[PDB]
């Protein structure tokens, strides 16, 4: 929902450069997750990037595998914790 | 009644929150909700001695040292958590330990090395490696799954035991 227009802008067989559009409000950080399409609970890897970024590099992917990539945004507002729904795409097969 | 300040640190997505909620609420959280900061308090009996667990469940891969230094200064014990399907999270442990040592100004801080998600089939960090790492640091290693509850009570209670035996 809240970061929009998640897309892959560069690829290698082992790595992806992804990009998204920041929301209007200030963000503390984004968490990026990646695992195989249809993975069970917990079968993913995750890292964090500052809220000033709107791209990230994912490494150590298996060549020719289909992945689900998800970007979460988190921060604080006067309404309390900012916890919007993440946005996801699938890439490679 | 004695209070123990425990801090759970480690990379993003390893199961720090799932572990803590499993201990506190006896339930597995299968939804991924990246943490900002969460604090929990629970009265328990460990080895027949009644005590209060004051648990800080931190955000993975904290970007700002001014944040990190606060909870590393107040914590009496640290669960250093990685995930057995995440090699990076394993290598990251070294930095977390270094940071803690630096803020404490000591080599002997009560700590437990925790390898979570042991219920997973496809594993990329072997027990051997983690046993070795733990050995070299001079701390316990506990394999856990927050999904099945394997080793969860063991991890936290062992950390409490380490603070008691400091
Ligand atoms: N299969 C399996 N999945 C697990 C296990 N522990 C946690 N998970 C899942 O992994 C995901 C991450 O769990 P979580 O506890 O939120 O990570 P975290 O370390 O707290 O993450 P953060 O707050 O630093 S970004 C969740 O979907 C959770 O259900 C486990 O032992 N086994
Ligand atoms: Mg968490």
Author numbering:
A (entry chain C): 3 to 95
B (entry chain A): 1 to 166
Q: Anything the authors wrote about it?
A:
Activating mutations in the RAS genes are frequently present in human tumors, and these RAS mutants play important roles in oncogenic transformation. Here, we report a monobody, termed 12VC1, that recognizes the active state of both KRAS(G12V) and KRAS(G12C) up to 400-times more tightly than wild-type KRAS. The crystal structures reveal that 12VC1 recognizes the mutations through a shallow pocket, and 12VC1 competes against RAS-effector interaction. When expressed as a genetically encoded reagent, it potently inhibited RAS-mediated signaling in HEK293 cells overexpressing EGFP-KRAS(G12V) and -KRAS(G12C) but not EGFP-KRAS(G12D). Together, these results demonstrate that 12VC1 is a highly selective, noncovalent inhibitor of KRAS(G12V) and KRAS(G12C).
